[PDB]
Amino acid sequence: PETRPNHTIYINNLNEKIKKDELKKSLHAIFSRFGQILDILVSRSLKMRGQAFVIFKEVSSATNALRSMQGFPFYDKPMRIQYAKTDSDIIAKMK
RNA sequence: GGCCGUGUGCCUUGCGCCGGGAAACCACGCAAGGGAUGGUGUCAAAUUCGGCGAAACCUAAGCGCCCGCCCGGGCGUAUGGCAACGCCGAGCCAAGCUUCGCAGCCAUUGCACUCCGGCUGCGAUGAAGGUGUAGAGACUAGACGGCACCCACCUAAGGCAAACGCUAUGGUGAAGGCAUAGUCCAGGGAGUGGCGA
Ligand SMILES: [K+]
Ligand SMILES: [K+]
Ligand SMILES: [K+]
Ligand SMILES: [K+]
Ligand SMILES: [K+]
Ligand SMILES: [K+]
Ligand SMILES: [Mg+2]
Ligand SMILES: [Mg+2]
Ligand SMILES: [Mg+2]
Ligand SMILES: [Mg+2]
Ligand SMILES: [Mg+2]
Ligand SMILES: [Mg+2]
Ligand SMILES: [Mg+2]
Ligand SMILES: [Mg+2]
Ligand SMILES: [Mg+2]
Ligand SMILES: [Mg+2]
Ligand SMILES: [Mg+2]
Ligand SMILES: [Mg+2]
């Protein structure tokens, strides 16, 4: 079910009524204690809606977030988590 | 209401002729004429403040000329006017179109890094157009207007076709809304008084 580890995590199955500006705040409290968040990519577009990308400094931050926050009911919806299949544009330039 | 004339707008035609266009054919200049100008639905709101320009036409203060000079007059003239109409600067506005948020139904389970799915609904912005521009003015409706679409003719870039060729998203179907069709309210027909020459 889970692919190979990454700096960023893929999140799906979310309530699409919430705005772009509001949803970025909710993640900066629950996941910020698992490790410091560099940047959050969220879009409401048809291809990118109900999806979020959370960038950590180290892999261990996301690996525990994968287990401890698995199936977390978010806005009355079961939140799924997978690893991102590609590195971020800011992350890849540092590696 | 009719007939003639001047001006300005208009189309047809002929001429010129550069500019746009792939072509049809638009745009520009002028002369002459008035034979010819497609259809249904749609939307009715803003309708303000200020500025620039105008032909014929009406008139003759100044000036010029003349009546041999003066007293008078005459003759020309707009630089005075009316006004068909050409327009700028700002504000504003129905529906349709561009974009932009905010709700509402509807689809959607989607791996990004640059924004971006459909609608009906409000609320806003942007472009076109309208208003400003009626006899001082107030209303009402359509259209000769904004929008959508249809019909005829003409072209064929692009797309289609192996091919004679097919096809509008491109042209033609005038202007009049500086009040058009109407209803009151002017003005004149019809008086008195300024200002003016
Ligand atoms: K006439
Ligand atoms: K030419
Ligand atoms: K204007
Ligand atoms: K008008
Ligand atoms: K062709
Ligand atoms: K057409
Ligand atoms: Mg005629
Ligand atoms: Mg009204
Ligand atoms: Mg004298
Ligand atoms: Mg004299
Ligand atoms: Mg005269
Ligand atoms: Mg004059
Ligand atoms: Mg005015
Ligand atoms: Mg008129
Ligand atoms: Mg008008
Ligand atoms: Mg008039
Ligand atoms: Mg009338
Ligand atoms: Mg009188």
Coordinates of C-alpha atoms (C1' of nucleotides) and ligand atoms in Angstrom, one line a residue:
Chain A
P1 CA 0.0 0.0 0.0
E2 CA 2.9 2.4 0.7
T3 CA 5.6 3.4 -1.7
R4 CA 9.3 4.4 -1.1
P5 CA 10.1 7.2 1.4
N6 CA 10.3 10.9 0.5
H7 CA 10.8 14.5 2.0
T8 CA 7.2 15.3 1.1
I9 CA 4.0 13.4 1.8
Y10 CA 0.9 12.9 -0.4
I11 CA -2.5 13.4 1.3
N12 CA -5.9 12.6 -0.3
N13 CA -9.7 12.1 0.4
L14 CA -10.5 15.6 1.9
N15 CA -13.6 17.8 2.1
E16 CA -13.4 20.2 -0.8
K17 CA -15.6 22.9 0.8
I18 CA -12.7 24.4 2.8
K19 CA -10.8 27.3 1.2
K20 CA -7.1 27.4 0.2
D21 CA -6.1 29.9 2.9
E22 CA -7.9 28.1 5.8
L23 CA -6.6 24.5 5.1
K24 CA -2.9 25.6 5.2
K25 CA -3.4 26.8 8.8
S26 CA -4.9 23.5 10.1
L27 CA -1.8 21.5 9.0
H28 CA 0.6 24.0 10.7
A29 CA -0.5 22.8 14.1
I30 CA -1.1 19.1 13.9
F31 CA 1.9 18.2 11.7
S32 CA 4.3 21.0 12.9
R33 CA 5.0 19.1 16.1
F34 CA 6.2 16.1 14.1
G35 CA 8.8 18.3 12.7
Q36 CA 9.2 21.8 11.2
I37 CA 7.3 22.4 8.0
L38 CA 9.2 24.1 5.2
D39 CA 6.3 24.8 2.8
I40 CA 2.7 23.6 2.1
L41 CA 1.4 23.1 -1.5
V42 CA -2.4 23.1 -1.8
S43 CA -4.6 23.7 -4.9
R44 CA -8.3 23.7 -5.4
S45 CA -8.1 22.9 -9.1
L46 CA -9.9 19.8 -10.6
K47 CA -6.6 17.8 -10.8
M48 CA -5.2 19.0 -7.5
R49 CA -8.4 19.4 -5.3
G50 CA -8.7 17.5 -2.0
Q51 CA -4.9 17.0 -2.0
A52 CA -2.1 18.4 0.1
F53 CA 1.7 18.3 0.1
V54 CA 3.6 18.7 3.4
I55 CA 7.4 19.4 3.2
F56 CA 9.6 18.4 6.2
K57 CA 13.3 19.1 6.8
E58 CA 14.0 15.4 7.5
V59 CA 12.5 12.1 6.4
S60 CA 11.9 10.8 10.0
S61 CA 9.3 13.6 10.5
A62 CA 7.1 12.2 7.7
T63 CA 7.7 8.5 8.6
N64 CA 6.2 8.8 12.0
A65 CA 3.4 11.1 10.7
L66 CA 2.6 8.2 8.3
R67 CA 1.9 5.9 11.3
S68 CA 0.7 8.1 14.2
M69 CA -1.6 10.2 12.0
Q70 CA -2.8 7.3 9.8
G71 CA -6.6 7.4 9.1
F72 CA -7.0 10.7 11.0
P73 CA -10.6 11.9 10.7
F74 CA -10.2 15.4 9.0
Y75 CA -13.3 17.5 8.7
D76 CA -15.4 14.3 9.2
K77 CA -13.4 12.5 6.4
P78 CA -10.8 9.6 6.7
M79 CA -7.5 11.2 5.7
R80 CA -5.2 8.9 3.7
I81 CA -1.4 9.3 3.5
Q82 CA 1.2 8.2 0.9
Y83 CA 4.7 9.1 0.0
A84 CA 5.3 11.6 -2.9
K85 CA 6.5 9.9 -6.0
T86 CA 8.7 13.0 -6.9
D87 CA 10.9 15.4 -5.0
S88 CA 10.0 19.1 -4.5
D89 CA 11.6 21.8 -6.6
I90 CA 13.2 23.5 -3.5
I91 CA 14.3 20.1 -2.0
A92 CA 15.9 18.7 -5.2
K93 CA 18.2 21.8 -5.5
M94 CA 19.8 21.1 -2.1
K95 CA 20.4 17.3 -2.4
Chain B
rG1 C1' -49.0 68.2 -46.6
rG2 C1' -47.0 69.1 -51.8
rC3 C1' -43.3 71.4 -55.9
rC4 C1' -38.2 74.2 -56.4
rG5 C1' -33.7 75.7 -54.4
rU6 C1' -29.0 76.1 -51.0
rG7 C1' -26.1 73.5 -47.3
rU8 C1' -24.5 68.9 -44.4
rG9 C1' -25.0 63.7 -43.8
rC10 C1' -26.1 59.2 -46.9
rC11 C1' -26.0 55.3 -50.7
rU12 C1' -25.6 54.3 -56.0
rU13 C1' -22.5 55.4 -60.2
rG14 C1' -18.3 57.1 -62.7
rC15 C1' -13.2 59.0 -61.8
rG16 C1' -8.7 59.4 -59.0
rC17 C1' -6.1 56.8 -55.9
rC18 C1' -2.6 55.8 -51.9
rG19 C1' -3.8 52.8 -47.2
rG20 C1' -6.0 48.0 -45.0
rG21 C1' -7.4 42.7 -46.8
rA22 C1' -5.8 36.2 -48.7
rA23 C1' -10.2 37.4 -51.9
rA24 C1' -14.5 39.4 -52.0
rC25 C1' -14.4 44.0 -50.8
rC26 C1' -13.6 47.9 -46.7
rA27 C1' -11.0 53.0 -46.1
rC28 C1' -9.8 57.8 -48.6
rG29 C1' -10.6 62.2 -52.3
rC30 C1' -14.1 64.3 -55.7
rA31 C1' -18.0 65.0 -59.5
rA32 C1' -23.0 63.6 -60.8
rG33 C1' -27.8 61.5 -59.5
rG34 C1' -31.9 60.2 -55.9
rG35 C1' -33.9 53.9 -59.2
rA36 C1' -32.9 50.6 -55.2
rU37 C1' -31.9 48.9 -49.0
rG38 C1' -33.7 41.4 -45.5
rG39 C1' -36.2 38.7 -41.0
rU40 C1' -37.6 37.0 -35.4
rG41 C1' -36.5 37.2 -30.4
rU42 C1' -33.8 40.0 -26.6
rC43 C1' -32.6 43.9 -23.0
rA44 C1' -35.2 49.3 -21.1
rA45 C1' -31.3 51.1 -17.4
rA46 C1' -27.8 55.2 -16.8
rU47 C1' -30.1 59.5 -18.8
rU48 C1' -24.6 64.1 -15.1
rC49 C1' -20.7 68.1 -14.9
rG50 C1' -17.6 70.9 -18.1
rG51 C1' -15.1 71.9 -22.8
rC52 C1' -13.9 72.1 -28.8
rG53 C1' -15.7 72.8 -33.7
rA54 C1' -19.3 74.1 -37.6
rA55 C1' -21.9 74.9 -43.4
rA56 C1' -25.8 77.2 -45.9
rC57 C1' -28.9 80.7 -44.1
rC58 C1' -30.4 85.8 -41.3
rU59 C1' -28.4 90.3 -40.5
rA60 C1' -24.2 94.8 -41.5
rA61 C1' -21.2 97.5 -36.1
rG62 C1' -16.3 98.3 -38.1
rC63 C1' -13.8 98.9 -42.5
rG64 C1' -13.5 99.6 -47.8
rC65 C1' -15.8 102.0 -52.1
rC66 C1' -19.2 105.6 -53.9
rC67 C1' -22.7 109.7 -53.9
rG68 C1' -17.4 116.0 -56.0
rC69 C1' -16.6 117.7 -49.0
rC70 C1' -20.2 118.0 -44.7
rC71 C1' -25.7 116.8 -43.5
rG72 C1' -27.4 112.6 -44.9
rG73 C1' -27.4 108.0 -47.8
rG74 C1' -26.2 103.9 -51.1
rC75 C1' -22.8 99.5 -52.1
rG76 C1' -19.7 95.3 -50.5
rU77 C1' -18.1 92.5 -46.5
rA78 C1' -19.0 88.7 -41.2
rU79 C1' -15.4 89.5 -37.2
rG80 C1' -22.3 89.3 -35.3
rG81 C1' -26.1 85.5 -35.3
rC82 C1' -29.3 81.2 -35.7
rA83 C1' -28.3 76.1 -36.7
rA84 C1' -28.4 71.1 -39.8
rC85 C1' -24.7 68.7 -37.4
rG86 C1' -18.5 66.9 -36.3
rC87 C1' -16.2 65.8 -31.3
rC88 C1' -13.0 65.8 -26.9
rG89 C1' -12.2 65.5 -20.7
rA90 C1' -14.7 63.5 -16.4
rG91 C1' -18.9 60.6 -13.9
rC92 C1' -22.5 56.9 -14.6
rC93 C1' -25.3 52.2 -17.0
rA94 C1' -29.9 47.1 -18.9
rA95 C1' -28.9 42.7 -21.1
rG96 C1' -24.8 39.8 -23.7
rC97 C1' -19.3 39.0 -23.8
rU98 C1' -13.8 39.2 -20.7
rU99 C1' -11.9 38.6 -16.0
rC100 C1' -12.8 38.3 -10.4
rG101 C1' -14.3 36.8 -5.7
rC102 C1' -18.9 34.5 -2.6
rA103 C1' -22.6 31.1 -1.8
rG104 C1' -25.9 26.7 -4.5
rC105 C1' -26.7 22.2 -7.3
rC106 C1' -23.6 19.0 -10.5
rA107 C1' -19.9 15.9 -11.8
rU108 C1' -14.4 14.6 -9.7
rU109 C1' -10.7 10.1 -5.9
rG110 C1' -7.3 12.8 -8.6
rC111 C1' 1.1 13.4 -7.4
rA112 C1' 1.9 18.1 -7.4
rC113 C1' 5.0 22.1 -8.1
rU114 C1' 3.0 28.4 -13.0
rC115 C1' -3.0 30.1 -12.7
rC116 C1' -6.8 27.3 -14.7
rG117 C1' -14.0 21.6 -14.5
rG118 C1' -19.5 22.8 -15.8
rC119 C1' -23.7 25.5 -15.0
rU120 C1' -28.1 28.9 -12.9
rG121 C1' -27.7 32.8 -8.8
rC122 C1' -26.1 37.3 -6.7
rG123 C1' -21.9 41.2 -5.8
rA124 C1' -17.7 43.4 -8.6
rU125 C1' -14.3 44.5 -12.5
rG126 C1' -12.7 45.0 -18.1
rA127 C1' -13.6 45.9 -23.4
rA128 C1' -17.4 47.5 -27.1
rG129 C1' -21.6 50.7 -27.1
rG130 C1' -24.9 54.4 -24.8
rU131 C1' -25.4 58.9 -22.0
rG132 C1' -23.4 64.0 -22.3
rU133 C1' -25.8 65.9 -28.0
rA134 C1' -34.4 67.7 -27.8
rG135 C1' -38.0 72.9 -29.5
rA136 C1' -35.8 75.0 -22.7
rG137 C1' -38.0 70.4 -20.6
rA138 C1' -41.1 65.7 -18.6
rC139 C1' -42.6 60.8 -19.8
rU140 C1' -43.9 56.3 -22.9
rA141 C1' -42.6 52.5 -26.5
rG142 C1' -39.8 50.0 -30.1
rA143 C1' -35.5 50.8 -33.6
rC144 C1' -32.6 53.7 -37.5
rG145 C1' -29.7 51.4 -31.3
rG146 C1' -26.7 47.3 -27.4
rC147 C1' -27.1 41.9 -27.7
rA148 C1' -28.4 36.8 -29.9
rC149 C1' -29.7 34.4 -33.9
rC150 C1' -31.7 33.5 -38.8
rC151 C1' -32.2 34.5 -44.6
rA152 C1' -30.2 36.1 -49.6
rC153 C1' -26.0 37.3 -52.4
rC154 C1' -20.4 37.5 -52.9
rU155 C1' -15.6 35.7 -51.6
rA156 C1' -12.5 31.5 -50.1
rA157 C1' -7.5 32.4 -45.9
rG158 C1' -7.9 28.6 -42.8
rG159 C1' -10.0 23.7 -42.1
rC160 C1' -12.2 19.6 -45.4
rA161 C1' -11.2 16.6 -50.2
rA162 C1' -7.1 12.0 -54.2
rA163 C1' -10.3 15.3 -57.3
rC164 C1' -14.2 19.0 -60.7
rG165 C1' -14.6 21.5 -55.6
rC166 C1' -17.0 22.0 -50.2
rU167 C1' -17.3 25.5 -46.2
rA168 C1' -17.9 32.1 -42.6
rU169 C1' -15.5 32.7 -38.3
rG170 C1' -14.6 37.2 -43.9
rG171 C1' -17.6 41.0 -46.7
rU172 C1' -23.0 43.4 -49.2
rG173 C1' -28.4 44.3 -47.6
rA174 C1' -27.3 53.6 -46.5
rA175 C1' -28.0 57.5 -43.4
rG176 C1' -31.8 59.6 -40.1
rG177 C1' -32.5 58.6 -32.3
rC178 C1' -28.1 66.2 -31.7
rA179 C1' -35.3 63.2 -29.5
rU180 C1' -37.2 58.5 -34.4
rA181 C1' -42.9 57.0 -33.4
rG182 C1' -46.2 59.1 -29.6
rU183 C1' -48.3 61.9 -25.3
rC184 C1' -48.4 66.3 -22.3
rC185 C1' -44.7 71.3 -21.9
rA186 C1' -42.2 75.1 -24.8
rG187 C1' -41.8 78.6 -28.8
rG188 C1' -44.1 80.7 -32.9
rG189 C1' -49.0 81.8 -34.9
rA190 C1' -50.3 86.7 -31.3
rG191 C1' -48.3 91.2 -26.7
rU192 C1' -45.2 94.3 -23.7
rG193 C1' -40.1 95.5 -21.9
rG194 C1' -34.7 95.4 -21.5
rC195 C1' -29.5 94.2 -24.1
rG196 C1' -27.8 94.8 -29.4
rA197 C1' -25.9 98.5 -34.1
Ligands
K1 K -35.0 68.3 -52.0
K2 K -3.8 48.2 -52.6
K3 K -16.6 57.6 -23.5
K4 K -29.2 61.1 -27.9
K5 K -8.9 27.4 -49.2
K6 K -21.7 36.7 -41.0
MG7 MG -35.0 56.7 -53.7
MG8 MG -37.3 55.2 -15.9
MG9 MG -20.8 110.2 -43.2
MG10 MG -21.5 103.8 -43.9
MG11 MG -25.2 87.8 -48.9
MG12 MG -19.6 82.6 -39.3
MG13 MG -22.5 69.6 -23.3
MG14 MG -32.7 64.8 -36.9
MG15 MG -29.7 59.4 -29.1
MG16 MG -32.7 69.7 -34.0
MG17 MG -40.5 63.5 -32.8
MG18 MG -42.9 86.6 -30.1

